Design an enzyme around this catalytic site. Structure first.
Site, PDB file in Angstrom:
ATOM      1  CE  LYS A 168      -1.436  -3.535   3.567  1.00 50.44           C
ATOM      2  NZ  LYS A 168      -0.080  -3.007   3.905  1.00 50.44           N
ATOM      3  CG  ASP A 169      -6.358  -2.367   6.099  1.00 48.88           C
ATOM      4  OD1 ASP A 169      -5.376  -2.415   6.244  1.00 48.88           O
ATOM      5  OD2 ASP A 169      -6.840  -1.418   5.184  1.00 48.88           O
ATOM      6  CB  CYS A 209      -2.410  -6.474  16.770  1.00 52.87           C
ATOM      7  SG  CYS A 209      -4.038  -6.003  15.752  1.00 52.87           S
ATOM      8  NE  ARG A 259       2.028   6.926   5.194  1.00 51.73           N
ATOM      9  CZ  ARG A 259       2.361   5.936   5.814  1.00 51.73           C
ATOM     10  NH1 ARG A 259       3.219   5.005   5.298  1.00 51.73           N
ATOM     11  NH2 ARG A 259       1.784   5.706   7.086  1.00 51.73           N
ATOM     12  NE  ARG A 261       5.550  -2.069   2.738  1.00 49.19           N
ATOM     13  CZ  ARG A 261       4.080  -1.453   2.406  1.00 49.19           C
ATOM     14  NH1 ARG A 261       3.499  -0.744   3.539  1.00 49.19           N
ATOM     15  NH2 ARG A 261       3.570  -1.671   1.245  1.00 49.19           N
TER      16      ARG A 261
HETATM   17  C1  LIG Z   1      -4.829  -7.690  15.064  1.00 50.08           C
HETATM   18  C2  LIG Z   1      -4.883  -7.423  13.526  1.00 50.08           C
HETATM   19  N1  LIG Z   1      -5.498  -6.403  13.073  1.00 50.08           N
HETATM   20  C3  LIG Z   1      -5.361  -6.555  11.539  1.00 50.08           C
HETATM   21  C4  LIG Z   1      -5.597  -5.295  10.815  1.00 50.08           C
HETATM   22  C5  LIG Z   1      -4.447  -4.411  10.411  1.00 50.08           C
HETATM   23  N2  LIG Z   1      -3.922  -4.816   9.285  1.00 50.08           N
HETATM   24  C6  LIG Z   1      -2.741  -4.206   9.021  1.00 50.08           C
HETATM   25  C7  LIG Z   1      -1.846  -3.926   7.694  1.00 50.08           C
HETATM   26  C8  LIG Z   1      -1.472  -2.757   7.343  1.00 50.08           C
HETATM   27  N3  LIG Z   1      -2.331  -1.812   6.469  1.00 50.08           N
HETATM   28  C9  LIG Z   1      -1.586  -0.639   6.356  1.00 50.08           C
HETATM   29  C10 LIG Z   1      -2.443   0.514   5.540  1.00 50.08           C
HETATM   30  C11 LIG Z   1      -2.826  -0.047   4.121  1.00 50.08           C
HETATM   31  N4  LIG Z   1      -4.123  -0.933   3.982  1.00 50.08           N
HETATM   32  C12 LIG Z   1      -3.959  -1.097   2.638  1.00 50.08           C
HETATM   33  C13 LIG Z   1      -2.972  -0.292   2.033  1.00 50.08           C
HETATM   34  C14 LIG Z   1      -2.930  -0.706   0.667  1.00 50.08           C
HETATM   35  C15 LIG Z   1      -2.458  -1.979  -0.021  1.00 50.08           C
HETATM   36  C16 LIG Z   1      -3.381  -3.185   0.078  1.00 50.08           C
HETATM   37  O1  LIG Z   1      -4.513  -2.878  -0.190  1.00 50.08           O
HETATM   38  O2  LIG Z   1      -3.222  -4.181   0.501  1.00 50.08           O
HETATM   39  C17 LIG Z   1      -2.330   0.131   3.050  1.00 50.08           C
HETATM   40  C18 LIG Z   1      -1.017   1.182   2.471  1.00 50.08           C
HETATM   41  C19 LIG Z   1      -0.070   0.442   2.213  1.00 50.08           C
HETATM   42  O3  LIG Z   1       0.134  -1.003   2.142  1.00 50.08           O
HETATM   43  O4  LIG Z   1       1.087   1.141   1.659  1.00 50.08           O
HETATM   44  C20 LIG Z   1      -0.366  -0.835   6.879  1.00 50.08           C
HETATM   45  C21 LIG Z   1       0.496   0.314   7.040  1.00 50.08           C
HETATM   46  C22 LIG Z   1       1.886   0.409   5.758  1.00 50.08           C
HETATM   47  C23 LIG Z   1       2.740   1.505   6.513  1.00 50.08           C
HETATM   48  O5  LIG Z   1       2.675   1.728   7.659  1.00 50.08           O
HETATM   49  O6  LIG Z   1       3.419   1.804   5.445  1.00 50.08           O
HETATM   50  C24 LIG Z   1      -0.144  -1.971   7.236  1.00 50.08           C
HETATM   51  C25 LIG Z   1       1.041  -2.493   7.865  1.00 50.08           C
HETATM   52  C26 LIG Z   1       1.738  -3.519   6.746  1.00 50.08           C
HETATM   53  O7  LIG Z   1       1.602  -3.620   5.757  1.00 50.08           O
HETATM   54  O8  LIG Z   1       3.030  -3.696   7.218  1.00 50.08           O
HETATM   55  C27 LIG Z   1      -2.542  -3.241  10.298  1.00 50.08           C
HETATM   56  C28 LIG Z   1      -1.355  -2.310  10.610  1.00 50.08           C
HETATM   57  C29 LIG Z   1      -1.761  -0.734  10.425  1.00 50.08           C
HETATM   58  C30 LIG Z   1      -0.619  -0.096  11.040  1.00 50.08           C
HETATM   59  O9  LIG Z   1      -0.406   1.171  10.547  1.00 50.08           O
HETATM   60  O10 LIG Z   1       0.284  -0.296  12.058  1.00 50.08           O
HETATM   61  C31 LIG Z   1      -3.624  -3.499  10.972  1.00 50.08           C
HETATM   62  C32 LIG Z   1      -4.054  -2.729  12.209  1.00 50.08           C
HETATM   63  C33 LIG Z   1      -4.277  -3.271  13.537  1.00 50.08           C
HETATM   64  O11 LIG Z   1      -3.115  -3.738  13.892  1.00 50.08           O
HETATM   65  O12 LIG Z   1      -5.262  -3.249  14.189  1.00 50.08           O
HETATM   66  C34 LIG Z   1      -4.729  -7.643  11.382  1.00 50.08           C
HETATM   67  C35 LIG Z   1      -4.491  -8.319  10.105  1.00 50.08           C
HETATM   68  C36 LIG Z   1      -3.227  -8.144   9.474  1.00 50.08           C
HETATM   69  C37 LIG Z   1      -3.040  -9.006   8.157  1.00 50.08           C
HETATM   70  O13 LIG Z   1      -3.769  -9.916   7.909  1.00 50.08           O
HETATM   71  O14 LIG Z   1      -2.007  -8.343   7.340  1.00 50.08           O
HETATM   72  C38 LIG Z   1      -4.188  -8.388  12.755  1.00 50.08           C
HETATM   73  C39 LIG Z   1      -3.621  -9.581  12.688  1.00 50.08           C
HETATM   74  C40 LIG Z   1      -4.507 -10.787  13.190  1.00 50.08           C
HETATM   75  O15 LIG Z   1      -5.821 -10.426  13.649  1.00 50.08           O
HETATM   76  O16 LIG Z   1      -4.122 -12.028  12.762  1.00 50.08           O
END
Ligand SMILES: *Cc1[nH]c(Cc2[nH]c(Cc3[nH]c(Cc4[nH]cc(CCC(=O)O)c4CC(=O)O)c(CCC(=O)O)c3CC(=O)O)c(CCC(=O)O)c2CC(=O)O)c(CCC(=O)O)c1CC(=O)O
Length: 340
Positions: free
Chosen positions: A81-82, A244, A156, A133
């Site tokens: 997801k990252d 994003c 957290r 969420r």
């Molecule tokens: C433009 C674009 N950038 C990205 C990268 C990107 N992905 C997210 C998703 C995300 N990640 C986290 C933190 C986190 N990472 C892994 C875990 C553990 C679970 C796992 O391994 O799967 C975590 C912690 C957790 O999930 O508890 C979060 C933050 C969660 C929170 O705030 O409580 C999230 C958001 C979510 O799941 O709702 C992000 C957002 C990070 C943020 O803090 O805002 C990003 C960063 C970015 O926007 O640059 C993507 C891929 C997204 C995807 O496929 O899910 C994209 C989209 C695209 O290019 O299409």
């Protein structure tokens, strides 16, 4: 023989996921030697200044992609997801590891043990910084407040235990599972309460797009059921063109020779929502195939050792669901959220 260099972050969950991937590769390749590189910038004090603006703080992922580019490292392990839907030029997701729990879970304040979000008292604060969420949980739980929590798993968790501000925090189940905090999971949220992010619970291995030697080795890690579901979800999200960080969630399943994909979009508050479900007859391929190097990657994924037909059907399914959501006005909700 070339030592396989694995680029990691000195973080705890980053290193755990990396170690798990390496343990699988090591079981496939008993002899193969692996070096682990971790750059923390000779201390957390140079990384603490970078915390002047956290959240979408994927500068670390750019550092890792700069090392790969230099040939400083050979493969990097990330949470799928990252990894964005469009990877930069010269990189690809070489392996999609078997999926861990994709669901969002609730951790409760030590007072609220045994109490689901449904049973918590009204106007209880719930810590989360995910717009995905918060948007879902605000709509579902109108009587609970959802404030922002900042930091990593242990920060957290510490904040919830110590301070009286939060009564529960939302977190990923796989995340807690890996850290060995499975005992703090209080409620595992189902799609009706909170659909999960795209590729959540699955690990992705990033490698150089033109490194056949590294793609070959890492291809062993591909799980076909996870790969197919993950293509569908990535294809749906990419096609939505959300920008994003937007309120986009998915749910996927593969039973009885059918790939089910549920995709949703919400306004930051949750009042307006377009949730829809589509399905395709896609059979999970047990057999690995010897496909060609000329086949372009799909939603950043190179899986030439897995039948291509079923992968194309998964992309199609995601695209179909994105197309329906856009027709129903999903484009409008996204732009409102990007502007807040
Ligand atoms: C433009 C674009 N950038 C990205 C990268 C990107 N992905 C997210 C998703 C995300 N990640 C986290 C933190 C986190 N990472 C892994 C875990 C553990 C679970 C796992 O391994 O799967 C975590 C912690 C957790 O999930 O508890 C979060 C933050 C969660 C929170 O705030 O409580 C999230 C958001 C979510 O799941 O709702 C992000 C957002 C990070 C943020 O803090 O805002 C990003 C960063 C970015 O926007 O640059 C993507 C891929 C997204 C995807 O496929 O899910 C994209 C989209 C695209 O290019 O299409």
């Amino acid at each position: 023989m070339r030592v396989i260099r694995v680029g990691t972050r000195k973080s705890q969950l980053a290193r755990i996921q990396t170690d798990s991937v390496v343990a699988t590769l090591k079981a496939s390749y008993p002899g193969l030697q692996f070096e682990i590189i971790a750059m923390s910038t000779t201390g957390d004090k140079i990384l603490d200044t970078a915390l002047s603006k956290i959240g979408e703080k994927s500068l670390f992922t750019k550092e890792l992609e700069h090392a790969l580019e230099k040939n400083e490292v050979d493969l990097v392990v990330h949470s799928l997801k990252d990894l964005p839907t469009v990877l930069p030029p010269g990189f690809t997701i070489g392996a999609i590891c078997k999926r861990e729990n994709p669901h969002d879970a609730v951790v409760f304040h030590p007072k609220f043990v045994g109490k689901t979000l449904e049973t918590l008292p009204e106007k209880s604060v719930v810590g989360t910084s995910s717009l995905r969420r918060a948007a879902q949980l605000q709509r579902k739980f109108p009587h609970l407040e959802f404030r922002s929590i900042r930091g990593n798993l242990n920060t957290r968790l510490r904040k919830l235990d110590e301070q009286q501000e939060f009564s529960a925090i939302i977190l990923a189940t796989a995340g807690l599972q890996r850290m060995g905090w499975h005992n703090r999971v209080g409620q595992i949220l189902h799609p009706e309460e909170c659909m999960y992010a795209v590729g959540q619970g699955a690990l992705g291995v990033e490698v150089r797009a033109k490194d056949q030697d590294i793609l070959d080795l890492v291809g062993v890690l591909h799980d076909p059921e996870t790969l197919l579901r993950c293509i569908a979800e990535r294809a749906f999200l990419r096609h939505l063109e959300g920008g994003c960080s937007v309120p986009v969630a998915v749910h996927t399943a593969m039973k009885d020779g059918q790939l089910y994909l549920t995709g949703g979009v919400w306004s930051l508050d949750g009042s307006d929502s377009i949730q829809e479900t589509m399905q395709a007859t896609i059979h999970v391929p047990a057999q690995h195939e010897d496909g060609p190097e000329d086949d372009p990657q799909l939603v950043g994924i190179t899986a030439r050792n897995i039948p291509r037909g079923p992968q194309l059907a998964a992309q199609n399914l995601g695209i179909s669901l994105a197309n329906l959501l856009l027709s129903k006005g999903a484009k409008n909700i996204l732009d409102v959220a990007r502007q807040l």
